[PDB]
Amino acid sequence: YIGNLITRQFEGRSNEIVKTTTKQRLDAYYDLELRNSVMDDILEMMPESIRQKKARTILQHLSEAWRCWKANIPWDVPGMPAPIKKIIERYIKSKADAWVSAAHYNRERIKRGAHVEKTMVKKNLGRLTRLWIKNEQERQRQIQK
């Protein structure tokens, strides 16, 4: 402890500090992955000659589409190049599986009562009331079909 302290006094602290992932920045890093994978699979299917300008637009389509999945809006972009619609539906189903599994995983953890945060109880109430109304809206639709 004191060997680190005095060498920090005599040399400063390191510029190369890299932050490992923890519980607080888990969903934030899961975003930065999910942005980059959709960046690659769409920048590989473009014709040729654009990199920086479509990245703004096409990831805002993802963020809008992820909101529409969370809201059970069907997310119809009117004229959309159908391979890109295949991509954005694919990763949002991928993010759906992580989002739904963490909702089941934390709900079993709360019922056991084994060290859940005060915030995570409200976050899990939010995710399950999304999923209960989705199950309700699905049940209304297949009754009407």
Closest residue by Cα to residue 71 from 37, 103, 96, 91: 96
Please state, in angstroms and rounded to a whole number, the distance separating the CA atoms of residues 2 and 127. 46
Cα 65 from chain centroid (whole Å)? 12
Cα 56 from chain centroid (whole Å)? 17
In the bound state with another protein, the residue whose beta carbon lies nearer, of 79 and 113, is 79
- Using CB under 8 A as the binding rule, the residues of this chain from 95 to 134 that contact another protein are 97-98, 101
Minimum distance of another protein from residue 89's CB (angstroms): 6
- Using CB under 8 A as the binding rule, the residues of this chain from 54 to 93 that contact another protein are 55, 59, 79, 81, 86-87, 89-90, 93
Minimum distance of another protein from residue 111's CB (angstroms): 20
Please state, in angstroms and rounded to a whole number, the distance separating the CA atoms of residues 46 and 38. 13
H-state helical runs in 12-117: 26-43, 53-71, 82-112
Q: Does residue 20 interact with another protein by CB under 8 A?
A: yes
For another protein, the binding residues (CB under 8 A) are 3-4, 6-8, 10-16, 18, 20-21, 26, 29-30, 32-33, 35-36, 40-41, 43-49, 52, 55, 59, 79, 81, 86-87, 89-90, 93-94, 97-98, 101
